[PDB]
């Protein structure tokens, strides 16, 4: 045969994936971990149809729309999470003389798993049309409204009107123009239907510019209609944070300063900005992922118990705890900027032709936040994010206060870890006895206890779009929430923009600046064993 | 000549194994069984106690406990490398034995386990065993025993002189005081060096007065660093599960109290009945048999305050302190049962035993509530349950945590912590977690069990509770042994109830063997803080 080279190739394929999984979890029980992971790798081997639904994607010619938004709508479609009569309209200034060719040669190529999904892509494209128009024309939005109304009137069922989800896959400088135009020309039919508007980051760049944008949108849409989306906040992580704590006496009781020594929230990527460091260059890693994404995780982790599990009680508590956070100081922040990797594989951040010469834009930051309330006073909250570092990894790590007595050096800090990348996991680390008579009471082991552990759908982005269709605003930042968050970070961001602290170089592929790990060790973190 | 002795040795070695296998596996064709085994056997093929001589003296060596449990446990420690290389084991009993080597190779070896693979080890082990036919109340015999022990102590290949002496009383308790007086008078360790430890078998009395009288009888001869009152059922693995999982860890240390725990149940369940020995059981009852001793020690370890160190006596100090916070159990806090024949007829009733007095009201089942009146536990019901001839074999601790009513409401329930010893070891929490992805909104949850145990690389076939206890005595660790003050406090918790029972004031409810027990018992548990899952 030549299939012998294919059987060997597959075998070596399963075994290398198993190798990487075992080497990540590092269980002492290698045999049973190998056993289950092979069994699991073989595994991988009417409320809402009641009304017409129209999705309008502004900026549909752009990078985000064709590479992420339309493919996510495709995945929701194939998962049967869109109603069967959904109509999707792309809206953009770009002339398109031939709409069917645009759908097939531009949009369809970025659809995922086109092999297995035979005939589903062409079915989905039937739900898509294109409107070439201006974002700031009231008349064009009246014309768009006539087109939407024709699609809503085709709905076969008895519910009148139609729901409209507007998706602003556009620079934020166009947001207020689009929302005014919708308000004046294309609100839902009076006979029935909601309007919801998905807004993309950046939501301003400091307290004053973000407040200006919110003030510009609020004449047109209220906080039950605006959905400020954070692509990275998956439903699974949020449920792990809320349910594992608040449904359980054991975890609820220790979620406080009497029991917790340190909290770290960490967002790491091996990729750099190598492609287009240029438009990262005026944002930097703090605005990019930490004032928005890591701070929402922080709010969900640190909030008081909400009055119910309803969306706005949860957002109420996110706002309440964020208000207890002192503005971060320049003394509590260490910045990095990555250079070329030791092996030359990854060029340095400045070696990008789209990055201005002499840029001091930070690609790495670690900072300490202080939450000054009864539950959290004195507990270090460390946020860390970095581009081009040693691994792809996103996790929460809670370190509990050590029980010095009576085990002494035979014990150490308990931990609770909630990981989103490279795979979902949630586990605790505690001291246990060692089985067998070889060990007296002082012979212990630091043991990991997995609540969940996945190998490396709908994804997080798709779950948020689905959340907006279902009217669930939990994972979206509210207007008041956003202002408080910007007030935590803006004094620091101003100090950085004045050069008061400056990034330390680090080679792509390392952990980052050595000073960042020194800062972490100085702010209450302790390494296991 | 060397090979002639080596050959006969090997032959006798195979023969001893075969005889043991036939005597134990009781085949009706002896000839066929010997042949199948013989061919199969062909196919089958610390520095501190290396330092001084060790002598283990087993009194009552002729008896049932000695041959069936104590010597085989000693064999298992020998194979696990847990006895010093030149250890000397002396069986001491009144029974005349005209042929000691026959006793060692036919009577003792019959009960050694896994002779298939350990037969040559069994022969090595028996070279360490001698037999002393003697009286327990003889000054002169104990002088003679001391001379035997000293001769072999004094030949020891090692740095320190003298020798450590471990005495095991595999005897009725009525003999303890006399044999202890004899040891103290004539067979204490040489003054030049060595400790003495004495393992005492149960029962330790049968109420406060009788138990105190026995302790008062023993204390002129051995202090509490010398007496080891053994409970065979309290294994090292459960005790470390109780102590380490809590006190080494912030997470469990912080919820181990009445602000967090709604109720605690400690349960000892057997499917077997009294198995034709109902007369022996009839004068003991289930409370004295397993509850005042075994379950109460588990309770003390679960409920105690943090010990000042992990030293054995610091732990025993805390066991004593928490037991002193418990009022004597009253009959309104107790439900008793006595088992009748199983519905299928496979288990005869307790009263159908011919050795059981007619009209006996002896309890074979009991559930009771104990209150620990202190800051950590005030208001927390502690339920002890023990039963013969019930629906399953099961020994566990179950801790129910106070429910988190808000915000999940009926989408959550009480967390639980379970520590299980039988029929297999386990330790886990039951908690409420999200249900994967999909429709599942925040309020869609399920209960899952989070294992709390360390999973080692190879399957650890760790020894039984009994052998770990003998090892602990050999190493000088009294943690799992009941101390004299602890014993008295425990009897005072239970004796007023045992008096009420012996006065007829509470009379067992019948229940068929194989059921859970009297239905009044499950009602009692439901009325005292437990909630079904
Ligand atoms: N993966 C991604 O692409 C990322 C997306 N984002 C955010 O998502 C949103 C869209 O991202 P992306 O597609 O990359 O952005 P683009 O800058 O590529 O804009 C998308 C579309 O918007 C129109 N557009 C661009 N500039 C203007 C302008 N001044 N006035 C009117 N229309 C304009 C263009 O379509 P036309 O000319 O046809 O009208 C363009 O094709 C932005 O808010 C962005 O900050 C942030 C992080 C990464
Ligand atoms: N598996 C078991 O058998 C269990 C027993 N125990 C306890 O262990 C101890 C011994 O158990 P077990 O072997 O069954 O008891 P036995 O009644 O069988 O006595 C053990 C030995 O002690 C001697 N003996 C018996 N009665 C007397 C007496 N009045 N005076 C002097 N010697 C006597 C006998 O040896 P000799 O005549 O040769 O001197 C006997 O063989 C007891 O305290 C028992 O309650 C606890 C756990 C389980």
PDB file of C-alpha atoms in Angstrom, chain A residues 168-298:
ATOM      1  CA  UNK A 168     -22.105  48.454  13.156  1.00  0.00           C
ATOM      2  CA  UNK A 169     -19.016  46.836  11.640  1.00  0.00           C
ATOM      3  CA  UNK A 170     -17.596  50.328  11.183  1.00  0.00           C
ATOM      4  CA  UNK A 171     -15.113  52.725  12.791  1.00  0.00           C
ATOM      5  CA  UNK A 172     -16.656  54.334  15.895  1.00  0.00           C
ATOM      6  CA  UNK A 173     -16.389  57.771  14.256  1.00  0.00           C
ATOM      7  CA  UNK A 174     -19.400  56.707  12.104  1.00  0.00           C
ATOM      8  CA  UNK A 175     -21.530  55.355  14.989  1.00  0.00           C
ATOM      9  CA  UNK A 176     -23.428  58.528  15.778  1.00  0.00           C
ATOM     10  CA  UNK A 177     -24.179  59.139  12.092  1.00  0.00           C
ATOM     11  CA  UNK A 178     -25.588  55.615  11.672  1.00  0.00           C
ATOM     12  CA  UNK A 179     -27.693  55.779  14.838  1.00  0.00           C
ATOM     13  CA  UNK A 180     -29.189  59.164  13.947  1.00  0.00           C
ATOM     14  CA  UNK A 181     -30.000  57.851  10.473  1.00  0.00           C
ATOM     15  CA  UNK A 182     -31.659  54.727  11.922  1.00  0.00           C
ATOM     16  CA  UNK A 183     -33.582  56.898  14.399  1.00  0.00           C
ATOM     17  CA  UNK A 184     -34.838  59.192  11.613  1.00  0.00           C
ATOM     18  CA  UNK A 185     -35.381  56.617   8.868  1.00  0.00           C
ATOM     19  CA  UNK A 186     -35.470  52.940   9.837  1.00  0.00           C
ATOM     20  CA  UNK A 187     -36.892  52.233  13.284  1.00  0.00           C
ATOM     21  CA  UNK A 188     -39.121  49.126  13.599  1.00  0.00           C
ATOM     22  CA  UNK A 189     -42.665  49.207  12.296  1.00  0.00           C
ATOM     23  CA  UNK A 190     -45.062  50.616  14.858  1.00  0.00           C
ATOM     24  CA  UNK A 191     -47.136  47.419  14.739  1.00  0.00           C
ATOM     25  CA  UNK A 192     -44.373  45.430  16.437  1.00  0.00           C
ATOM     26  CA  UNK A 193     -40.699  44.531  16.807  1.00  0.00           C
ATOM     27  CA  UNK A 194     -37.642  45.669  18.797  1.00  0.00           C
ATOM     28  CA  UNK A 195     -34.483  47.398  17.568  1.00  0.00           C
ATOM     29  CA  UNK A 196     -31.075  46.462  18.957  1.00  0.00           C
ATOM     30  CA  UNK A 197     -27.762  47.936  17.878  1.00  0.00           C
ATOM     31  CA  UNK A 198     -24.430  46.126  18.228  1.00  0.00           C
ATOM     32  CA  UNK A 199     -21.556  48.575  18.693  1.00  0.00           C
ATOM     33  CA  UNK A 200     -17.882  47.648  18.144  1.00  0.00           C
ATOM     34  CA  UNK A 201     -14.815  48.781  20.068  1.00  0.00           C
ATOM     35  CA  UNK A 202     -13.019  51.092  20.655  1.00  0.00           C
ATOM     36  CA  UNK A 203     -15.607  52.743  22.922  1.00  0.00           C
ATOM     37  CA  UNK A 204     -13.661  55.952  23.098  1.00  0.00           C
ATOM     38  CA  UNK A 205     -10.087  56.083  24.310  1.00  0.00           C
ATOM     39  CA  UNK A 206     -10.483  57.788  27.715  1.00  0.00           C
ATOM     40  CA  UNK A 207     -13.213  58.980  30.057  1.00  0.00           C
ATOM     41  CA  UNK A 208     -13.989  62.153  28.111  1.00  0.00           C
ATOM     42  CA  UNK A 209     -14.045  60.736  24.569  1.00  0.00           C
ATOM     43  CA  UNK A 210     -16.050  57.690  25.678  1.00  0.00           C
ATOM     44  CA  UNK A 211     -18.566  59.897  27.507  1.00  0.00           C
ATOM     45  CA  UNK A 212     -18.886  62.032  24.357  1.00  0.00           C
ATOM     46  CA  UNK A 213     -19.711  58.963  22.252  1.00  0.00           C
ATOM     47  CA  UNK A 214     -22.281  57.665  24.766  1.00  0.00           C
ATOM     48  CA  UNK A 215     -23.811  61.146  24.896  1.00  0.00           C
ATOM     49  CA  UNK A 216     -23.954  61.140  21.088  1.00  0.00           C
ATOM     50  CA  UNK A 217     -25.781  57.778  20.947  1.00  0.00           C
ATOM     51  CA  UNK A 218     -28.175  58.184  23.868  1.00  0.00           C
ATOM     52  CA  UNK A 219     -30.702  60.474  22.086  1.00  0.00           C
ATOM     53  CA  UNK A 220     -31.272  57.570  19.677  1.00  0.00           C
ATOM     54  CA  UNK A 221     -30.979  54.312  21.663  1.00  0.00           C
ATOM     55  CA  UNK A 222     -31.324  53.426  25.335  1.00  0.00           C
ATOM     56  CA  UNK A 223     -29.410  50.798  27.314  1.00  0.00           C
ATOM     57  CA  UNK A 224     -31.913  48.082  26.480  1.00  0.00           C
ATOM     58  CA  UNK A 225     -31.204  48.694  22.768  1.00  0.00           C
ATOM     59  CA  UNK A 226     -27.395  49.211  22.691  1.00  0.00           C
ATOM     60  CA  UNK A 227     -25.133  46.137  22.869  1.00  0.00           C
ATOM     61  CA  UNK A 228     -21.456  47.113  23.314  1.00  0.00           C
ATOM     62  CA  UNK A 229     -19.790  43.863  22.305  1.00  0.00           C
ATOM     63  CA  UNK A 230     -16.624  42.252  23.706  1.00  0.00           C
ATOM     64  CA  UNK A 231     -15.790  39.404  21.321  1.00  0.00           C
ATOM     65  CA  UNK A 232     -13.739  37.549  23.923  1.00  0.00           C
ATOM     66  CA  UNK A 233     -16.257  37.231  26.756  1.00  0.00           C
ATOM     67  CA  UNK A 234     -17.551  33.709  26.275  1.00  0.00           C
ATOM     68  CA  UNK A 235     -20.744  32.505  27.898  1.00  0.00           C
ATOM     69  CA  UNK A 236     -18.868  29.502  29.350  1.00  0.00           C
ATOM     70  CA  UNK A 237     -16.336  31.545  31.333  1.00  0.00           C
ATOM     71  CA  UNK A 238     -19.047  33.857  32.676  1.00  0.00           C
ATOM     72  CA  UNK A 239     -21.192  30.932  33.855  1.00  0.00           C
ATOM     73  CA  UNK A 240     -18.126  29.365  35.499  1.00  0.00           C
ATOM     74  CA  UNK A 241     -17.515  32.636  37.367  1.00  0.00           C
ATOM     75  CA  UNK A 242     -21.110  33.265  38.459  1.00  0.00           C
ATOM     76  CA  UNK A 243     -22.584  29.802  39.005  1.00  0.00           C
ATOM     77  CA  UNK A 244     -19.598  28.074  40.593  1.00  0.00           C
ATOM     78  CA  UNK A 245     -19.416  30.849  43.183  1.00  0.00           C
ATOM     79  CA  UNK A 246     -23.010  31.875  43.868  1.00  0.00           C
ATOM     80  CA  UNK A 247     -24.833  28.532  43.631  1.00  0.00           C
ATOM     81  CA  UNK A 248     -22.468  26.923  46.193  1.00  0.00           C
ATOM     82  CA  UNK A 249     -21.939  27.585  49.891  1.00  0.00           C
ATOM     83  CA  UNK A 250     -18.390  26.169  49.735  1.00  0.00           C
ATOM     84  CA  UNK A 251     -17.135  28.692  47.175  1.00  0.00           C
ATOM     85  CA  UNK A 252     -19.389  31.635  48.209  1.00  0.00           C
ATOM     86  CA  UNK A 253     -17.967  31.527  51.751  1.00  0.00           C
ATOM     87  CA  UNK A 254     -14.295  31.871  50.752  1.00  0.00           C
ATOM     88  CA  UNK A 255     -14.797  34.522  48.002  1.00  0.00           C
ATOM     89  CA  UNK A 256     -13.502  37.400  50.118  1.00  0.00           C
ATOM     90  CA  UNK A 257     -10.455  39.052  51.680  1.00  0.00           C
ATOM     91  CA  UNK A 258     -10.523  36.817  54.764  1.00  0.00           C
ATOM     92  CA  UNK A 259      -9.646  33.897  52.489  1.00  0.00           C
ATOM     93  CA  UNK A 260      -8.079  35.132  49.233  1.00  0.00           C
ATOM     94  CA  UNK A 261      -4.461  36.256  49.025  1.00  0.00           C
ATOM     95  CA  UNK A 262      -4.167  37.256  45.354  1.00  0.00           C
ATOM     96  CA  UNK A 263      -6.222  37.412  42.149  1.00  0.00           C
ATOM     97  CA  UNK A 264      -4.594  37.366  38.697  1.00  0.00           C
ATOM     98  CA  UNK A 265      -6.395  37.833  35.390  1.00  0.00           C
ATOM     99  CA  UNK A 266      -4.078  37.127  32.462  1.00  0.00           C
ATOM    100  CA  UNK A 267      -4.431  37.427  28.644  1.00  0.00           C
ATOM    101  CA  UNK A 268      -1.465  36.065  26.650  1.00  0.00           C
ATOM    102  CA  UNK A 269      -0.864  35.568  22.922  1.00  0.00           C
ATOM    103  CA  UNK A 270       2.103  34.217  20.972  1.00  0.00           C
ATOM    104  CA  UNK A 271       1.204  36.310  17.907  1.00  0.00           C
ATOM    105  CA  UNK A 272       2.365  39.891  17.646  1.00  0.00           C
ATOM    106  CA  UNK A 273       0.910  42.799  15.740  1.00  0.00           C
ATOM    107  CA  UNK A 274       3.267  41.866  12.924  1.00  0.00           C
ATOM    108  CA  UNK A 275       0.822  42.427  10.110  1.00  0.00           C
ATOM    109  CA  UNK A 276      -0.538  45.848  10.978  1.00  0.00           C
ATOM    110  CA  UNK A 277       1.098  47.171  14.132  1.00  0.00           C
ATOM    111  CA  UNK A 278       0.203  50.568  12.698  1.00  0.00           C
ATOM    112  CA  UNK A 279      -3.405  50.795  13.886  1.00  0.00           C
ATOM    113  CA  UNK A 280      -2.551  49.069  17.139  1.00  0.00           C
ATOM    114  CA  UNK A 281      -0.038  51.875  17.579  1.00  0.00           C
ATOM    115  CA  UNK A 282      -2.461  54.542  18.796  1.00  0.00           C
ATOM    116  CA  UNK A 283      -4.407  52.045  20.978  1.00  0.00           C
ATOM    117  CA  UNK A 284      -1.827  49.975  22.843  1.00  0.00           C
ATOM    118  CA  UNK A 285      -2.446  46.842  24.878  1.00  0.00           C
ATOM    119  CA  UNK A 286      -4.247  48.526  27.810  1.00  0.00           C
ATOM    120  CA  UNK A 287      -7.038  50.073  25.722  1.00  0.00           C
ATOM    121  CA  UNK A 288      -6.969  47.066  23.401  1.00  0.00           C
ATOM    122  CA  UNK A 289      -7.795  44.355  25.937  1.00  0.00           C
ATOM    123  CA  UNK A 290      -7.442  45.382  29.556  1.00  0.00           C
ATOM    124  CA  UNK A 291      -9.710  48.406  30.203  1.00  0.00           C
ATOM    125  CA  UNK A 292     -12.466  46.561  28.315  1.00  0.00           C
ATOM    126  CA  UNK A 293     -12.094  42.778  28.306  1.00  0.00           C
ATOM    127  CA  UNK A 294     -10.097  42.046  31.476  1.00  0.00           C
ATOM    128  CA  UNK A 295     -12.026  44.634  33.483  1.00  0.00           C
ATOM    129  CA  UNK A 296     -15.376  43.004  32.690  1.00  0.00           C
ATOM    130  CA  UNK A 297     -13.984  39.658  33.862  1.00  0.00           C
ATOM    131  CA  UNK A 298     -12.773  41.475  36.986  1.00  0.00           C
TER     132      UNK A 298
END
